[PDB]
Design a protein around this nucleic acid. Structure first.
Lengths: 88, 66, 156, 129, 225, 70, 259
RNA sequence: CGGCCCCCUGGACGAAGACUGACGCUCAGGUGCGAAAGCGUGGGGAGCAAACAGGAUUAGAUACCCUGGUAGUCCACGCCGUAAACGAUGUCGACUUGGAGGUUGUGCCCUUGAGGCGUGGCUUCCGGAGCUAACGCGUUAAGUCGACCGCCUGGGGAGUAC
């Protein structure tokens, strides 16, 4: 999993209040970081299918979040995707 | 009638050999949780400890072996 | 005063060491031409005896049915085992439009005017039972009023 | 997921009737409340009571006459999967007039008879008998 | 008529263990002390009174009461109760279809009566020893089974019961015919067949006796009326 | 099941003790079990079946017991 | 009203769970069944053998009051565990009384050691004590007139498992079971143990502070196979038993009774 | 999926709070994972063992039994894409009497003791109403309802041919 400190850092940056944590953008960021982390793992361990399932799920969740953001508020979404470097 | 619930131990210790020895057979085998009446959660831990001990030659795997 | 109709009589067998022992089942239904109906299912080695038994059974454990004039009070479904039955109240003159066992029960009950289809199974015994159930459940306007805490004119 | 609240409410009511429960509670909604009111008017329930500010709970008080339940039958007709709208001439008669059909019309939710009287049809919510 | 204090003393308020309960007795239960169910005496008493009243009323119109209790602890007591108010009873095993199948059981009763007559009024004696013994045995059997109900004639107009779960057959029979039922119903029992349920301890002897006695009194009163 | 004959102990007694020890060990039983390969499925089946049997013995029979035989 | 609620908490206040409050009045006697009513849901089926004192005949008629015991409710129909154990608590209280003045005095008469301590019997009950407790010194009551009268001066008690060895003559002088399971071990230490349940292969006598013994069917008597242990000994009775075997590992102490 | 240890790693549950504010449910096509056997290339090969051989048994014995025994089972990386892949029971949500357990949290309580009173998650058995052709299911529904999808339309021919 993502280390506590790292998570906190992520929250602080993206979250407006820094105590917020549940902001859509923040959540997305958290997901994204985790995904990035797991890439390294999965390069090594290609047959770790069970673990990869979780990763996939996370990705899906992130996508959903992004979609939600888009309909609600476009500018914010755009900003987020610039920050994280998500192609979509 | 579990011992570890009453003592209130956080984790069973493989080093605590004497304690282990009560839960092991004359033939070396780990004694069932029916007989000892150990709680399930603790029982597993105990087993693990015993195994560890066996690896460290603190407890024997069996009576015959040498 | 009571009218009684033997719906069906069926020969049923029991296999024994020797061979087959045969017997007869009689399904009857009785009614007073008003609300009261009762079916009876009797069994014996000979037919007439069986029929008699059935009749006897019928005569006890009768059941009352609220009848608005010659017909039913509203469309009513009744089910029992395979036989599921629909019966619908109908205008004076139309007669009992219903099939088989179902018809007989209606006739004794003193419904004169119905539109009634038996869906599913048409196994006489089951279908008569279903019909009876339907009749039984069927509530009157007065009854409904009583239930709801209203007058009959409030319900219409 | 929860897709049909009215339907759920109806189901709850039915279950209460079955199980000889005195009162049946659920999360409140305006439509639901209206329905409850209608039922009360038509005399299928004793009383309804909404309670709460943030997340209010509608509590119906079920009725029992001579042991058995009052609400003999209660079905949704319109449902999210397949909506039913009737014109004032096409409005039904539940149990040949002895039961009622809750119908939502432009002039609020009402019984079928009421709607007919008014001279307007609408979305048929539920039959109650 | 019967007070609450007296009932308490008797041990009416005690019920069965919580695992053996019926959830249809949840209204009549108060609480659970030491993992044993306590019957609510506030709800019991009025019901009991009502039942008593009903019984009295029945008596007044010359009603035939039947007292059923085949527990074997309170077999002695129920018989006594029956006899005090000269009513009928079934203190030993209820014959399956005693009431529903009366017409067959009426023959049995007749036979028993005949046997009794032979024993007593005849004064003939001079009988083969084995045969005589057999006859005696038969008589004993009959007496045990149908002693209380031999003078009942027809069917009873009400049915008092000491345990509903134990005498369910009797209760069922009474429902099929439509005879009013007055059952003492502990927490384990089912009250649905019973017309005039009495929430109370079927098992305890003193309680049972108490239940009997009041009923007997009421019957007597009715008779007097 | 290692055993040593005590001083002034009878032979028969010793033998009995040994037997008891063996029984406790469940050595013979173990040997019997490992004589032939049991498919996993079969093993599972036996275990569950046995459990079921045990359950039946415990509860149903207890229920029966409540009612007298004669 | 709340009359009943208050009456309920009142009746809670005026009873307790063990056999403590002497409350059941003996309301029917018939051999071989006594029966009381201590304010419980049902009446006890009491044996007659929890109530005859020291020579075999009954002592209590109608109206008499002994407490029984509790904490076990409904086996189908009925209420209690026996009042005789009740008595054990009273015995414990008298034994405890010693502590106050460092000397409990009654009569103790101990002829011999089943398992290394003379047996002492107080009133109806007889208890077994470790070998030292019988005599203050090396006096030995084997030379004393048989079943002699002294008292008991306590030597040793085991505090969990109930074994008490007491001091005859010499008036002037004044986890848990299984680690150290070597006390009653060595080959044949006789014990006094109450049997619990006889499982048609066994008898299950088990007394010594949370253990389990069997005395299964083979010994029990001097007939092997046709015996059926329910016929031959008892239910709930303190008997002659000794160990014959301990496994401290697969907790099976395999006692015997043919000795 | 089962010895023990370490490294990397996914999910579940509980405890309180704090936050986000319908972001949800289902899903034709699509994508992935998918026992055993089987295939490819390269390793490995103790035991077991299709095939095969011999010895029995038998009327025969291309079987069962016995003695041997090679693919295979084992590892790496690919493919295969099926099984009584079963709870023969799609997924998600709501509601409706009870009892006896197991397991894993957690709150209070003199833990005066292995306990006492609750409250959550997953789970085994029995059984009520109801349901069911019956068998049975029964708060983990096969009950009472809603949302979406998948699938069935007499047996064979055939899950075969093209």
């Amino acid at each position: 999993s993502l280390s506590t400190e790292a998570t906190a850092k992520i929250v602080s940056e993206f979250g407006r209040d820094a105590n917020d944590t549940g902001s859509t953008e923040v959540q997305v960021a958290l997901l994204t970081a985790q995904i990035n982390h797991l890439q390294g793992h999965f390069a090594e361990h290609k047959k770790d299918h069970h673990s990869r399932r979780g990763l996939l799920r996370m990705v899906s969740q992130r996508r959903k979040l992004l979609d939600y953001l888009k309909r609600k508020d476009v500018a914010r979404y755009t900003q987020l995707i610039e920050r994280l470097g998500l192609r979509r | 009638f579990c011992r570890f619930t009453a003592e209130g131990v956080q984790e069973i210790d493989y080093k605590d050999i004497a304690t282990l020895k009560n839960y092991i057979t004359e033939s070396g085998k780990i004694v069932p949780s029916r007989i000892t009446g150990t709680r399930a959660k603790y029982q597993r831990q105990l087993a693990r400890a015993i195994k560890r001990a066996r690896y460290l030659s603190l407890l024997p795997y069996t009576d015959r072996h040498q | 005063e009571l009218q009684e109709k033997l719906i069906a009589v069926n020969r049923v067998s029991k296999t024994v060491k020797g061979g087959r022992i045969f017997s007869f089942t009689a399904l009857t239904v009785v009614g007073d031409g008003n609300g009261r109906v009762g079916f009876g299912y009797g069994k014996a080695r000979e037919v007439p005896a069986a029929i008699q038994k059935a009749m006897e059974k019928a005569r006890r454990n009768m059941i009352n049915v609220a009848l608005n004039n010659g017909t039913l009070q509203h469309p009513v479904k009744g089910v029992h085992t395979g036989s599921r039955v629909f019966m619908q109240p109908a205008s004076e003159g139309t007669g009992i439009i219903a099939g088989g066992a179902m018809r007989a029960v209606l006739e004794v009950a003193g419904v004169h005017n119905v539109l009634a289809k038996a869906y599913g199974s048409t196994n006489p015994i089951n279908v008569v039972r279903a019909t009876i159930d339907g009749l039984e459940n069927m509530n009157s306007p007065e009854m409904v009023a009583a239930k709801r805490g209203k007058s009959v004119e409030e319900i219409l | 997921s929860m897709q049909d609240p009215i339907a759920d409410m109806l189901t709850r009511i039915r279950n209460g009737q079955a199980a000889n429960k005195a009162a049946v509670t659920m999360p409140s909604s305006k439509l639901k409340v209206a329905i409850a009111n209608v039922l009360k008017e038509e005399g299928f329930i004793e009383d309804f009571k909404v309670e709460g500010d943030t997340k209010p709970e509608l509590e119906l008080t079920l009725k029992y006459f001579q042991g058995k339940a009052v609400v003999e039958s209660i079905q949704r007709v319109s449902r999210p999967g397949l909506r039913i709208y009737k014109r004032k001439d096409e409005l039904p008669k539940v149990m040949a007039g002895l039961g009622i059909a809750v119908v939502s019309t432009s002039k609020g939710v009402m019984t079928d008879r009421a709607a007919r009287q008014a001279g307007l049809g609408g979305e048929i919510i539920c039959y109650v008998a | 008529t019967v007070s609450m204090r007296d009932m308490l003393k008797a041990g009416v308020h005690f019920g069965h263990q919580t695992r053996y309960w019926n959830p249809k007795m949840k209204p009549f239960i108060f609480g659970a002390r030491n993992k044993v169910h306590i019957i609510n005496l506030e709800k019991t008493v009025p019901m009991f009174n009502e039942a008593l009243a009903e019984l009295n009323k029945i008596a007044s119109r010359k009603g035939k009461i039947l007292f059923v209790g085949t527990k074997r602890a309170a077999s002695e007591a129920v018989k006594d109760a029956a006899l005090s108010c000269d009513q009928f009873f079934v203190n030993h095993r209820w014959l399956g279809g005693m009431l529903t199948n009366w017409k067959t059981v009426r023959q049995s009763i007749k036979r028993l009566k005949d046997l009794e007559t032979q024993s007593q009024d005849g004064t003939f004696d001079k009988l083969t020893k084995k045969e005589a013994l057999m006859r005696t045995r038969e008589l004993e059997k009959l007496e045990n089974s149908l002693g209380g109900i031999k003078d009942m004639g027809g069917l009873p107009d009400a049915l008092f019961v000491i345990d509903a779960d134990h005498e369910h057959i009797a209760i069922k029979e009474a429902n099929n015919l439509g005879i009013p039922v007055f059952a003492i119903v502990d927490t384990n029992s089912d009250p649905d067949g019973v017309d005039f349920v009495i929430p109370g301890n079927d098992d305890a002897i003193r309680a049972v006796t108490l239940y009997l006695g009041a009923v007997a009194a009421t019957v007597r009163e009715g008779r007097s009326q | 099941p290692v055993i040593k004959v005590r001083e002034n102990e009878p032979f028969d007694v010793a033998l009995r003790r040994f037997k008891r020890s063996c029984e406790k060990a469940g050595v013979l039983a173990e040997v019997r079990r490992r004589e032939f390969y049991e498919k996993p499925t079969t093993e599972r089946k036996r275990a569950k079946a046995s459990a079921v049997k045990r359950h039946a013995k415990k509860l149903a029979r207890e229920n029966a017991r409540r009612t007298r035989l004669y | 009203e709340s009359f009943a609620q208050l009456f309920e908490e009142s009746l809670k206040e005026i009873e307790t769970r063990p056999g403590s409050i002497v409350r059941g009045v003996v309301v029917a006697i018939d051999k071989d069944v006594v029966l009381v009513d201590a304010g419980l849901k049902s009446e006890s089926a009491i044996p007659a053998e929890q109530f005859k004192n020291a020579q075999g005949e009954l002592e209590i008629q109608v109206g008499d009051e002994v407490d029984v015991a509790l904490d076990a409710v409904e086996d189908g129909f009925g209420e209690t565990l026996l009042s005789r154990e009740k008595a054990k608590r009273h015995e414990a209280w008298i034994t405890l009384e010693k502590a106050y003045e460092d000397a409990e005095t009654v009569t103790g008469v101990i002829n011999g050691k089943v398992k290394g301590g003379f047996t002492v019997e107080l009133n109806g009950i007889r208890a077994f004590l470790p070998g030292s407790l019988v005599d203050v010194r090396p006096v030995r009551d084997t030379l004393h007139l048989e079943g002699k009268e002294l008292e008991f001066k306590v030597i040793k008690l085991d505090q969990k498992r109930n074994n008490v060895v007491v001091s005859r003559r010499a008036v002037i002088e004044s986890e848990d079971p299984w680690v150290a399971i070597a006390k009653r071990y060595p080959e044949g230490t006789k014990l006094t143990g109450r049997v619990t349940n006889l499982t048609d292969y066994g008898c299950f006598v088990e007394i010594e502070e949370g253990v389990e013994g069997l005395v299964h069917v083979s010994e029990m008597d001097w007939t092997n196979k046709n015996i059926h242990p329910s016929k031959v000994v008892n239910v709930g009775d303190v008997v002659e038993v000794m160990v014959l075997d301990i496994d401290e590992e697969r907790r099976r102490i395999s006692l015997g009774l043919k000795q």
